[PDB]
Amino acid sequence: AKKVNSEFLTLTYGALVTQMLRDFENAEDVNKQLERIGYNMGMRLIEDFLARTSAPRCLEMRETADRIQQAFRIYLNIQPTISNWSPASDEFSLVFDSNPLTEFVELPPDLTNLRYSAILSGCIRGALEMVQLEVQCWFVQDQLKGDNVTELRVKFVRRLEEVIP
Amino acid sequence: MTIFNLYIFDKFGTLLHYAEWNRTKKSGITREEEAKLTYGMLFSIKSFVSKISPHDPKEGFLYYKTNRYALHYLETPSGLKFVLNTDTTAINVKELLQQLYAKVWVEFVVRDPLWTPGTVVTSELFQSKLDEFVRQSPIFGIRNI
Amino acid sequence: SEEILFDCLHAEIVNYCLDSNKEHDLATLEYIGFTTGYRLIERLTREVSRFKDELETMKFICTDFWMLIYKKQVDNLRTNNHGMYVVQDKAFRFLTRISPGTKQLEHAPKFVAFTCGLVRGALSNLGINSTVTAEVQSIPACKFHIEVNRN
Amino acid sequence: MIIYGVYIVSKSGGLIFNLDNNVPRIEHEKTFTYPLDLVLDYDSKKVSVSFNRKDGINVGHVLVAVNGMPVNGVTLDDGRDVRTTLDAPENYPINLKFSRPKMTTNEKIFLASMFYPLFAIASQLSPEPKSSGIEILEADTFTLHCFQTLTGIKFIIISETGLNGIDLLLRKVYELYSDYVLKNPFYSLEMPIRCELFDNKLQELLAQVEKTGISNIDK
């Protein structure tokens, strides 16, 4: 019994999105502020993830995908199928058969533009600017939007390097 | 392993935190300029070891040892820097500093809502946890490799 | 373990500090969360009788919930002369992350609000009937007094 | 096992003697295709890669000569730009030749110049009192041994991580330093070392240290 410890985040995040909604009617506010708070979140968890894994750093793209799928595996307990590889291979698609942030919130959030993975964006984004990766993120497909399966698409841009020590 | 003192600096280069247990020689210059001098110390060391190494630096610099003390270093992939300092004789302290990082600093800095990155870490709770954690196996020495 | 996700997410729960509501979170988080906790409760040691009533103290469900959630049961669990009562803990899990100095009390009640306004039951001490306020005198020592919503 | 670069610096710190042991820097080759996974980021005449490391390629690793055409700065020897060929897909697949940028003489001079005050100012206000500057540095792939002769000369030799007894090698190079400075007072105490005698006797020392055993102190 009491196997699943974590079905409380799918409803904590639900409370977040509902109250952000009731505060600001705009569908994109509850996306961007939610993304920046999930960004600080990613800052806060990448430190512990590297504390356990002791990975050197994401100097390469495939190893970065491995580290990120490992991060999802350890905390959010989902297996990101790394697919859709670009010929330049600067980008890769994360295939989540089951959303880990939610467990069946519902397919209609009554209205579109309600980006339901903004923390996930922070989850993927924040760590990068902490592991020194100036990287852009965006979602190519969301099963929650009436779709079969959720794919994310994250594009590294500039190797963040420390300056003027 | 009881040690002289520990330094924690953010990737930007500010003094996140300092800890002292055995530092005997008390400097005359301020420990702030001392912290900045240590950070320049470390970054220029990293450049030196990166460039004069004939083979790929995976984690770069490890430590330096002197006549009378020794200094040990830890680079996080986050860019955070830990540095410890003590006398000579002990187990290698790379895993020691890693254990301190994971078990204490991650536990009692990052997890604190009061802790906001980009600032100093001032909390008696973390000072305690760090103190008793160094006092966990606290004989002495380094001889780090 | 799966604790740091909730710890950080709750830190951001605090973080948005809009100047409208002392409840950064509404009792909705409560309802859904202990509804999942009730999913955990598919067995409870309460009799099957339709003709007889047996009460499941909210104290016991509170402590088992806490082991499932906060992972440290009550240290003081006092039954007030009313139908209400009070819970006192020398330490709190979210408060273990901070020193005992009284600097920002107001966060901790928002933390523990997760046990406030819970979807009730009919009988006294029946498991979930919860109207409660947080009155914390010491930083680790979190105190919470319930008030019977009816009467 | 070998002593990678034996150096020495004056009180001012100018690298006196860039005694390089035979050090084969790794050369990599690969026949690449249409525009690349490799980060062909241009950085100040150093057409290198920062991200997307594959096949034992490091950040420093820089193209030397596509199909045996050495690069001048950023351009082709024939005068086309690197990216000029990068945009052109007809020649593909094309053979890129990567090597880590080999530290030239002036590079090593600048490296020692920038290094010197580090050791000189090495935690001057260190926690332990009456201490010295950095005596031994140990890195990911090498270990530097710096030995001050209590004033003036700093013997700086970089050896393998697992190597032991390097202090004795410092002793012998101290001996041979004396055996050299025997001859030329017009060789200033801060002029760079230019003498083939020191060179050949240190080649003998290298041949010895191919063998670990140092005895009757081995030269």
Author numbering:
A (entry chain C): 10 to 174
B (entry chain E): 1 to 145
C (entry chain D): 2 to 152
D (entry chain F): 1 to 219
Recite the paper's sentences.
The overall shape of the complex is that of two arched arms connected at one vertex with TRAPPC12 and TRAPPC13, and then spreading apart to hold the core between their other ends like a pair of tongs. Overall, we were able to model the core, and the N‐terminal halves of TRAPPC8 and TRAPPC11. The C‐terminal halves of these subunits, along with TRAPPC12 and TRAPPC13, were unmodelled as although helices were recognisable in many regions, the sequences could not be attributed. The primary interactions between the core and the arms are via binding of TRAPPC2 and TRAPPC2L to TRAPPC8 and TRAPPC11, respectively. Two additional points of interaction between the arms and the core are visible in the TRAPPIII map as indicated by continuous densities between the flat surface of the core and the middle regions of both TRAPPC8 and TRAPPC11. TRAPPC8 is linked to density formed by the connection of the first two α‐helices of TRAPPC3b and TRAPPC5. Similarly, density from TRAPPC11 connects to a region formed by the first two α‐helices of TRAPPC3a and TRAPPC6. We detected 146 total cross‐links, and 75 of them mapped to residues present in the structural model—32 cross‐links were inter‐molecular and 43 intra‐molecular. None of these cross‐links exceeded the maximum distance constraint for disuccinimidyl dibutyric urea (DSBU) of ~30 Å, thus providing good validation for the atomic model of the TRAPPIII complex (Appendix Fig S5B and Table EV1). The TRAPPC8 arm is positioned such that it would contact Rab1 that is bound to the core, indicating how the arm could determine the specificity of the complex.
